[PDB]
Amino acid sequence: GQVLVVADDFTGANDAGVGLAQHGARVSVVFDVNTLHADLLGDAVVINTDSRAARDDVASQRTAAAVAAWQAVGGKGWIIKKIDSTLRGNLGAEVAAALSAADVPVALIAAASPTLGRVTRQGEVWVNGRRLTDTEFASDPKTPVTSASIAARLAEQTALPVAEIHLDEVRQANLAHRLQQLADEGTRLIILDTDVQDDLTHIVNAARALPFRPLLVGSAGLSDALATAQDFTRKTEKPLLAVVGSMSDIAQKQIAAARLRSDVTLVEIDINALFSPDSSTVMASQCEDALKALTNGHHCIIRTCQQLGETISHYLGELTRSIVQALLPGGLYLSGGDIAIAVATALGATGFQIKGQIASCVPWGYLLNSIVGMTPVMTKAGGFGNETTLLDVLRFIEEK
């Protein structure tokens, strides 16, 4: 379940860390492997060997040492050796060291970052329409690149046997069988074409179907694909409590988009069940439902499905007050205007100090004199925004 990233510079290390963090991981860059310990392993560790311009033997020793340090404290899961997408650096020395340390039959080298314009075709890196050696990245002034061929570049520093798998063969359903075959034959480095991100997904899927964990070697593209495949559980410490009484079409869209997420829980309030005498019992249950969501790190969205609107606004005001007294949350989002004022009033607020706005239509700030203290509060008028407005509020609370 754990990931080790070994990068040869600052930017590679950051890009890896950011990708893992965006996909739910607890991730840190550790400056000296001698501060590595077991509690730092979950979910990902990133080490910068700062070896892009170093001697090949130093680059190799540092890469090997990073892997061994992670293993020594109980690291087990996936190791990715991050390389320059434009093939600068001590590629062969570092890949060989990482593979030796990993002690598995093969490394999968899938270097492409398609969304950044780097692809691999017949074993060679192309950048925006040209082979790598036909671009500026091959023009020094620290690490000149003398070949677009990944094999040729590796061969400058390691004689490990290699094999290329070009794009049509990559895309076959039986890729994992082909990888195993190459491993069985004594191939050590397998270099894979890639044109789009789906190719890297497929490659990681094949990697995961092997009876061992191969070393992974790539740039941002492979790192992103690995991060996705880990399926990290998204958990925010102080999540949003959202109370939505708008029946408008755009609110359904906004909520649906949030609903797609695995860290979002809906509590649905039936309007019809508001007039039965068990309404109190049912409210207590909705309240309990909200608590469980928030205490387990899920954003919680409460939503409904003349005097009607008023009975509804009062009830949600009452439920929200109930939830606050039972408790978190990291923020409170209220929509539309009727809900906002009913809920704020129910929380004893005398006003709303506005600090700014989110997503061009969600005022945010703090309620004054209310039982939620300095909890950020957000509002939105009915009908406003687009499909991702609630997603934008979620991100705001997560970053808090």
Swiss-Prot record:
Protein's name according to its UniProt entry: D-threonate kinase
Record's function text: Catalyzes the ATP-dependent phosphorylation of D-threonate to D-threonate 4-phosphate. Can also phosphorylate 4-hydroxy-L-threonine, with lower efficiency.
Keyword Kinase in record: yes
A Pfam family assignment: SBD_N
InterPro entries: 4-carb_acid_sugar_kinase_N (IPR010737), 4-carb_acid_sugar_kinase_N_sf (IPR037051), NBD_C (IPR031475), NBD_C_sf (IPR042213)
UniProt cross-references to Gene3D superfamilies, sorted A to Z: Four-carbon acid sugar kinase, nucleotide binding domain (3.40.980.20), Putative sugar-binding, N-terminal domain (3.40.50.10840)
Residues bound to ATP: S246, G336, G337, D338, I339, G382
EC annotation from Swiss-Prot or TrEMBL: 2.7.1.219
Protein residues bound to substrate: D9, R52, K82, I83, D84, S85
Magnesium among keywords: no
Provenance organism: Pectobacterium atrosepticum (strain SCRI 1043 / ATCC BAA-672) (Erwinia carotovora subsp. atroseptica)
